[PDB]
Amino acid sequence: GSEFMGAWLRAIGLERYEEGLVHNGWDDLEFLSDITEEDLEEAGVQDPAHKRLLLDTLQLSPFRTVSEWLESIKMQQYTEHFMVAGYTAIEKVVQMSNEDIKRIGVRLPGHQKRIAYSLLGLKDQV
């Protein structure tokens, strides 16, 4: 979580990077595990040893409706964005591309990625 991630970063000496991660949508420890080196660079983590430590540490440890699905990944702030753009049923959201996710107003990379990873699992399920 946003506070929990701050403590997690502080525990490994990477508190300096909290603001940049959070500002890029990497704001929840539960979903940080899919972050890549490239994502880190984009979020302000330039130092190779700092990226390595963050990534090494992460190694250690059917929905009926669109709103229910978004709630499961803590992305309910975007429910109206999806609904007004016509992505109003699970059978519609599973067809979305990364370009569609951005177009409808998901701007933060960590949120874009969270949604895209989650859709893979949904598509597999349906």
Residue numbers in the entry: 1196 to 1256, 906 to 970
Sentences copied from the publication:
The Eph (erythropoietin-producing hepatocyte) transmembrane receptor tyrosine kinase superfamily, with its first member identified years ago, contains 14 members in mammals and is the largest among all receptor tyrosine kinase families. However, the cytoplasmic portion of all 14 Eph receptors are highly similar, each containing a membrane-juxtaposing kinase domain, a protein-binding SAM domain immediately followed by a short carboxyl tail PDZ domain-binding motif (PBM). Our study reveals that the Eph SAM domains have exquisitely specific target SAM domain-binding properties, although their overall SAM-SAM heterodimer formation modes are very similar.
ITC (Isothermal Titration Calorimetry) experiment revealed that EphA2 SAM bound to SHIP2 SAM with a dissociation constant (Kd) of ~2.22 μM at a 1:1 stoichiometry. To elucidate the molecular mechanism governing the specificity of the bindings of SHIP2 SAM and Odin SAM1 to Eph receptors, we determined the crystal structure of the SHIP2 SAM-EphA2 SAM complex and the Odin SAM1-EphA6 SAM complex at the 1.5 Å and 1.3 Å resolutions, respectively. Taking the EphA2/SHIP2 complex as the example, a special cation-π interaction between the Arg958A2 and Phe1226SHIP2 was uncovered by the high-resolution crystal structure. The guanidinium group of Arg958A2 forms hydrogen bond network with Asp1222SHIP2 and His955A2 on one side and with the backbone carbonyl oxygen of Ile917A2. As such the guanidinium plane of Arg958A2 (and its delocalized π-system) is in the same plane with the π-system of the planer peptide bond between Ile917A2 and Lys918A2, forming energetically favorable π-π stacking with the benzene ring of Phe1226SHIP2. Whereas the rest of Eph SAMs contain a Lys in this position except EphA10, which is an Ala. Based on the structures shown in Figure 2F, replacing Arg958A2 with Lys would eliminate the planar π-system formed by Arg958A2 and the Ile917A2-Lys918A2 peptide bond and thus seriously weaken the binding, even though the positive charge at the site is retained.
